[PDB]
Homo-oligomer: A and B are copies of this chain.
Amino acid sequence: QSRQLFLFGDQTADFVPKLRSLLSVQDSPILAAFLDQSHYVVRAQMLQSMNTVDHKLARTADLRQMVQKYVDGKLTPAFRTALVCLCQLGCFIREYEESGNMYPQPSDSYVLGFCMGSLAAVAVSCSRSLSELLPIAVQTVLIAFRLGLCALEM
Tell me which residues across on chain B come within 8 A of A127, comparing CB atoms.
100
Query: With an 8 A cutoff between CB atoms, is A44 at the interface?
Result: no
**Total contacting residues, chain A, CB less than 8 A:** 20
Q: Oligomeric state, in number of copies?
A: 3
Asked if A131 contacts B96 (CB within 8 A), the reply is: yes
List residues 92-141 of chain A with CB under 8 A from any CB of chain B.
96-98, 100-103, 105, 127-132, 134
Query: With an 8 A cutoff between CB atoms, is A33 at the interface?
Result: yes
Asked if A129 contacts B130 (CB within 8 A), the reply is: yes
Q: Tell which of B30, B98, B100, B102 touches A30, judged by Cβ atoms closer than 8 Å.
A: B30
Asked if A102 contacts B100 (CB within 8 A), the reply is: no
State whether A129 and B30 are in contact (beta carbons under 8 Å apart), knowing that A102-B105, A103-B102, A105-B102 are contacts in the complex: no
**12 A-B pairs whose Cβ atoms sit less than 8 Å apart in the complex:** A28-B131, A29-B33, A30-B30, A96-B131, A97-B131, A100-B129, A101-B128, A101-B129, A102-B103, A102-B105, A102-B128, A103-B129
The 9 tightest CB contacts between A and B, nearest first, are: A100-B132, A29-B29, A102-B128, A29-B33, A97-B131, A100-B131, A29-B30, A100-B129, A102-B129
A residues neighboring B (CB under 8 Å):
28-30, 32-33, 96-98, 100-103, 105, 127-132, 134
